[PDB]
Symmetry: D4
Subunit: 214 residues, 8 copies
């Protein structure tokens, strides 16, 4: 069924072994992790909690990666089956064979974590819904070029070549467009107006948690 | 050569001006600085009390001659341009032009065309500024909400930037989706680009960098 | 400044002439007209109000058309200047010359209407913001084709060729895509789910007036 | 000819079957109805208690032969196909194949290929169903809110329909914006298209219209 | 409703026909087989010696009603269509229509529209045949020579196939380069496609497969 | 400088070793090979020449592959440098070290072949110039579909969906277009007319060798 | 059948009236006009022939315009039918009615000209076949821009933005591409090499008349 | 940070250089003028008889550091870059690095990075020269013949210009058809563009305009 990215096998090894106290603090902190939090500030929360070890800290990527799976889980998919399917996949890529005690404790630890992966599921939902668009912005760059006006017996233009890099059809693409100084000003004003509108939409609808991924 | 019927009244008017008024029009067109629009040329005539309302009404037609001066064949005298324009007006006059008016028109267009040097530079700049694969026209941002539905409230604010541009002489739309951080980073790049323009102006201080108006 | 579509000159003629009572009822009804109402149900509201005549009814297109202008009107554009600029444009396309009394009454009547064009301005804003997208849907059609599977010594496919007609870059365009029976079912389910989500978004946010243009 | 290393175990297994098991595999593959997926072929072997787990493990490899049967040169005997496959397996066996196994493999593939007639029809249908300029894969709708900001609350609900399709062997996205009425009218057309399919099935009742699985 | 000024003479003419002529027009339009063009409808009127030249001159206008019958709202009587057309003609008559002619036109259009059933099917086929992403219009092949220049005579013959098509209601060109073998293989596929059409006609023998004309 | 496709190292091994008689027959046959001949009919010519062995036959791909290099060779690129650059590259991918006698004989044999690779260079030139187009045809397929005309109380269309597969921008692409029966006939006539024009262009210009690659 | 561009009705008026001597010289000169000659050098040939009048000179556009029709004329289309169909169309756009004598003389004069329109038919064939391409060049322009390299405590690039204007799908389009100085040099060399190849193709195949339209 | 296995030998080599050799490498890299390619850097090391073959073998790896210097976070010391590179090498050393070599590598990379200022400018120019919507790579012209077939010899010579370019990080082809006059006019514009470049160099004489190599 599942196949585990080879670099996460280290984190499942750790996860089969976390102490029943430590796994509960680690799952507790995961549930406390607010929606939109990236893995590095989940790591930072682990690294500072004096109840969580360096081993828990090293498991953060594996735990956080389950959010990509959690979006598939139906209303009647049981988390026990998920914890076992991940446990059987983990064992199948050993050259050792995983002892039954380690197997049981891993199923339990993953299940305990999956029970608390609620805001993590919302974080992967937010991340995919943010990029469900025809053209998702990634970066911009502006070249500020000079175009000299040649004469028939000292005059010139400055052209702002805006590059937008975007994803469309899962493909990295670039759009170039030519702006004068006044175009750059009026586009800056529309961008400012859209930020002003974002702050208005947050003060209204103040009962919605609006999410930033970065 | 043909004259658009939009401007026939202006060649008529311009054929009717005094040597004093037309000499003042040409000198004023010569002082008009490169990058000046027709509104500033009209404004400058209006404030000169030795140019009439007929001179002011000619100003839009005169400013159009900046374009033709880009198209002329390089061996042509401006006198052949003035004659060709005058016949192209007379051809549109179903009432036949007076011989006095034909002389005055060739004279008046040619005296103007002699000072059209900055008008030519102004139209070169207009051409060269839009000699680009995609030319910006307008921008608009739709600040949309996308709610995150749980299976059993949380949401995204998505900035849908619309860029309107000309390409292949065609008017087109580019939509792209930005979050708050993307909007700041795009704004930060635009500022940095405006700073770069001011640097290229502070260096290269002997080049006049012109803004279209 | 302005130029008036030749067929609306009839409606300005009527509008210069509505009775001070009738113009106030007509502007009152305009302000009562809810956002998203099209001109034909503004006409229908006029046609039924026993205080508004057949002449008011014939003016409805001209009044309703001002909403396209009202989106340009700045915070310090005065409605008097709008009413006069429309009045000077109206007179300039007469072959008669408009008498001063008719001019004054038209400025007043248009201004009285423009003061009540609030939900009409929102209706034109809604209409433009609804079509501010890369591809605005206009129509769909499905061809239900048969593709026979030929054999080497009675079997076939049914292919649902969905056509979407859309506007992009102000251009009328068509997109064809090929669906099997199961694709048509799963797309129908996503469309149903999106309608369910629209009804949820209306019950939440029940303090927002959500607008349909048709 | 080459065998993908994904299926080498299946030719090995299939070379190891009894004449009884392989005769039952071929007959069962012959009864498998057109449009059956490999899951149904596997399921049908599993429930036949005279086919082994080795037979069940061969089923994915056998079902792949439906594709090759579309590519074969029309004068070829299925016996030349079986030999070419057997050499293409032996070429991948760095441990050299037994002569008994070479006979059994050519025999076992050929007995199967003799009954692959509905498997060929099933793969024709798969090809012909995706022989289209744009083939549907998935749909998703984002129900977004677009607030109408007054200069001094009102909003639009916009259904952003995403269609995912294959074109030019490439995976692509088409986004289109719908209002509530557009979504109903599109749904109404889909229903009408499903009704048309049932009519084409009720008429033309002697054609088997197959669904891919 | 509006009438194009191209056809006003035809509604005029058609308003002027006898109950005998108009009954013969409708019956003849009813016998006209699906897929018949206006040339065949004109030809069939011409050879019927009880239809006049005025009937023949009406034929192009009548054939245009096949299109409108695709656009009508399904609850409408054909009598409301005939009235709406008659007012749309009277609206274009700056000389006002006689009341007798208004009755005769509603009568004459409605008697025709009653037999337009195969004309409707003919226009459905026209629509459905061009309800495609790219519709063929024309082909042309340029047989070009490309010489192989040695550094110190040999050449390629390249068949530049041009396909002209409609897409997005726009007229477009597709050029593709073929060698001699590609041209034969493309020709071989077209023949095989024509054979497949004749098979689908020999089977399904109770379906009328219509050609546009 | 060069790097040798690992499967051609076998053919260079053979080529370092062909007998001075056999290499001259093999190069002689290569020069006799007419422009447009593919490797399999070069192989077939080797396989039948009673002076060329099975070893020569196994070298045909390596010899024929030099035509892709021969298009780069300038007016003052010496074939000795080519034969050595290929010989030094061959040795560099051994785990053995190639003996000097084998090195000298390979340089000589390759040089003798390269001196006779004239029509082979024209064959690679022909092959590249044939595909120097915006859209190079690879294959066509026609689906012969039925489109039924539904009615409001037994009529249908047959639509020939022609697929052309082509290369553009080094990318495999497909173009679908819809034809009726008469379109298929008129396109067939234009294709026939273009074949007739090819035969005319060959009878005129009968002093040009016109090349087919397949 | 035909409809005549309103400005060519003047030339048919002249053509109905040319003298039997003059029409034969005018058709004789047309047959002498070499393939690729434009109308202005047909006019120039008329203007200098002392047997052709100013009236013949004014007819040159109408005569030359028949080449666009002549490409449609089949192997069994008779020129008499063409001359009459053009004559009946000419008369139908008079407000006068054309006298029978004028009608007969026009049919004869056009037919006499059409009999000599051979190189004119080749000139319209050449003109259409020259533009039977995916992208027909119309104009180029290069902007020579400066791109300054900014620094972190006097260096720059010159970028040659080549614009090609072309027709594709009957649409006026532009392609911009960015070149450095060396790209401009190497493209110039390929263009020179293609001109050298054109001169070679003319010296070989010296029995073909190679045509330039401009 | 990761090192590509293509360059691991170069960090190894570079970790093994003397303070004398590495000081000469850095100074020489500092004198290398902006726009110099790695071939000229290699050539300049080779001719300096106080740099070894190991120094010459390091040159390709050093020249690659111009790229990383565009990506560094602006607050970073070059010392943190050198450490990060050294750990990224040690991470790829399955045989563990000596502590002496770790010091020498951080030292040797940092002494080089101190003089990489013109290497940074050289890589900026490379980036900025290809920061364009379509970047030229190659051109080719096919001089084709198109014979004019009479119904009962004459021909066109058509110059098929192919431009190869990068767009969207993708390699693409633009074909356009030119006649002899179009080819001359395009050549005339290119010359005029080269003249304009020399003018922009003769004016603006205090700017170094660099050519990529």
């Amino acid at each position: 069924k599942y196949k585990i990215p080879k670099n996460f096998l280290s984190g499942f090894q750790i996860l089969s072994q976390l102490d029943k106290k430590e796994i509960e603090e680690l799952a507790k902190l995961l549930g406390e992790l607010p929606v939109g939090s990236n893995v590095q500030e989940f790591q930072s929360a682990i690294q500072t909690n004096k109840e969580l070890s360096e081993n828990a800290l090293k498991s953060a990527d594996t735990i956080f990666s389950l959010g990509g799976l959690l979006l598939e889980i139906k209303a009647d998919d049981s988390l026990n089956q998920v914890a076992e399917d991940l446990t059987n996949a983990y064992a199948k890529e050993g050259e050792e064979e995983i002892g039954t005690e380690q197997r049981e404790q891993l199923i339990h630890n993953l299940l305990i974590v999956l029970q608390k992966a609620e805001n993590l599921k919302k974080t992967f939902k937010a991340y995919r819904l943010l990029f469900e668009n025809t053209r998702s912005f990634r970066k911009s760059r502006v070249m500020t070029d000079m175009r000299m006006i040649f004469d028939d017996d000292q005059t010139g233009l400055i052209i702002h070549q805006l590059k937008l890099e975007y994803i469309e059809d899962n493909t990295s693409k670039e759009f170039f467009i030519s702006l004068d100084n006044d175009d750059v000003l009026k586009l800056s004003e529309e961008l400012k107006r859209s930020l002003e509108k974002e702050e208005c939409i947050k003060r209204d609808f103040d009962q919605v948690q609006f999410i930033n991924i970065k």
